[model samples]
Target: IDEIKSRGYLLVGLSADFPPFEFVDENGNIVGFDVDLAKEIARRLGVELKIVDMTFDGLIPSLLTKKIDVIISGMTITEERKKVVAFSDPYFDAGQVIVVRKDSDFRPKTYEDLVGKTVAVQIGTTGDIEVSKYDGIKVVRFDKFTDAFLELKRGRADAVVLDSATARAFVAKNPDLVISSGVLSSEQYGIAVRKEDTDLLEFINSVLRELK
Candidate 1:
């Protein structure tokens, strides 16, 4: 706690528009699981949580430049990202799932079924990378998860591929949109810090462990 107080503030980068994770609510306040998680971490550290909203693609570069002290966004742990930043131990387990219109005939049981289909995914996300592997499929990238869901709702895409928790949250509001069969792959969500900050990384890991 002294360390954070000495630093003055803890900057956290987040999309701030992803629901069930982080988003601006009706009252115009940022709130969600990720927001709450950051709040708790900040409270424990005796520092204020200063959220910086940015596009998903900008998160890594921002971290590398020390624009944010940490990233509490719903970022998945992937080998590709491990090359640049350091990630804390798994805090949440999630899996890839597809959201399709309830009336649509498409029942994608796996990634293979998405071949030659138009699927919407958030830019710079693991779902986008996974969906891109299908040779003939049209991968539509959006800046926000809600935009992807909107594309699915408007019939602009065949399906929306995203984290299962997010997919379920969308389904809750739009009962007409259903989450298809099984997940594409399982993944762990983690907080990312600068690669050189090993000490701070360990501190965060310990905090997560104690919280669990």
Candidate 2:
């Protein structure tokens, strides 16, 4: 607490591409549900909220390097991530989904259905981890969700795997794309901090419960 309060600001890292959670608005300001949650956290701590925008894959590295204090991005809680970063109590329920071109006949209902298919995913995300678990699937990685969606739009990738809500948001804007089936995983969203920052993690969990 003294470490953060002494600095007088809370640094938050996020990628502003996942709509309705964290995205860049028309005014060029970051705004969404996660942003709101981050704001309240800063308010409760009586500190300034400083947002640091970066690639989705770099958030954890940034946190570890002390370039940022925490990550309030639309990050899913996973066993792999928990090894390096401590996560707050689950704040949102988000699951994985497969997205394909609306005109395409390829409808994958399971990971097994993706055999010999090219799947696009944001590098280092749960979507990447889940899809990569299967051997026959060819995974195409990108630094941002926008680029991954573009690969799907360009007909270069068979489908794009990502969080359901963000996939819905992207599909809404691009009529050519649609969610292929029900969610893939019952993933939960959580705020991430350095593994050593248990005090910060406890504080964040408390705020999450209060917000809930």
Candidate 3:
């Protein structure tokens, strides 16, 4: 805490394109549920907030390298991720979803319909991991979900796999998109701190408990 205090701010890592959770406003500033959460967390620590915007994949590695003190992105808590960093607590319970163009016939009632189809997702996300587990489906990965959805929008991909909440955010803004499959799996989001940095994690958990 002393080291982070010397910097006079809590450095947070997040991908700004994931709406409702994180995104840039019209004024060119990061704002979302997670952004406000980060600010509130920092305030409790007696410091200001500093955001480090990057791809969703880079968040864990950035936190590991100490480039960022904490990660508050809409990041899922997984066994694989737990190996690298300590998760504070589950903040958001989101689910995986398959999306397609509103008027397209690429209807995927379940995962089976997705076989042999090209699916787009953000690299290193749970959507990327779970989809990769299946056979015959082509998983196209991008640095951000927006770019992956853009590929789907451009007809380069048949479908898109992502969080249900974020999918709703994008679909609400895009008239041509729709959620083909309501939910694939259950997921929980957590703030991340380095494994060795229990102090920070404990502090974050304290704040989360109060918020809850």
Candidate 4:
């Protein structure tokens, strides 16, 4: 609490288009499960929460440049990402799933099935990295999940790879889409902070433990 008073406000970075996790509501204000969670964290600290909107790929770069105090976006914690920034204890466990048109003949039971296929994935996502492994596969990267889903709906892509939770949320809204039977990779989501911000990292981890 005293630290919050010293800082005056807590700056948070979020991708406002990732529904269920974070997105802009009807009132043009950012609201979602993660948004509410951040609000609660700020409330507990007796500080104001300031959310910064940006592309998913920009979150870590912004954090590295000191543009935000923490990243609360639906960013997955991967071994590759740990070299650049520090991540708090994971708050959510998720896995990659394929979203395809209900009647499409494409049934990807594994990543190998996606080889030589064109897959749509959000830029800087774990899905993008996973899809990139196939030498012959063409990766159609979008700045937002909605854009990736649109490409799939328009027949511009063979399949859409996204987090299971997000795929479920999207498929719930669009019954024409279905999640594949197999998952690509399982991962955990975490809040990112600058590499040297040990104090802040410890504080955030403690808060996360309390939330659990």
Deviation of model 3 at 111, angstroms: 1.8
Off by over 4 Å in 2: none
The residue ranges of model 4 lying beyond 4 angstroms of the native Cα positions read 1-4
Q: What would the per-residue lDDT of candidate 3 be over residues 64-88, giving only the tens digit for each residue?
A: 8889999999989999998988897
Ranking by TM-score: 3, 2, 1, 4
Q: Write the per-residue lDDT of candidate 1 for residues 126-150, one digit (tens) a residue.
A: 9998889888779999998878888
Candidate 4 whole-model C-alpha lDDT, 0 to 1: 0.86
Worst 10 residues of 4 by lDDT: 1-10
Report the error of model 3 at residue 63, Å: 1.2
RMSD of candidate 2 to the truth, in angstroms, is 1.2
Each candidate structure's TM-score, on Cα atoms with residue i matched to residue i, is 0.95, 0.96, 0.97, 0.94
Query: At residue 173, what lDDT does model 1 achieve?
Result: 90
Query: For residues 113-150, could you state the per-residue lDDT of candidate 2 as single tens digits?
Result: 98899999999899899899999899999998999988
Off by over 4 Å in 3: none
Give the total clashing residue pairs for model 1.
0
Q: List lDDT for all candidates, in order.
A: 0.87, 0.91, 0.90, 0.86
Better of 3 and 4 by TM-score: 3
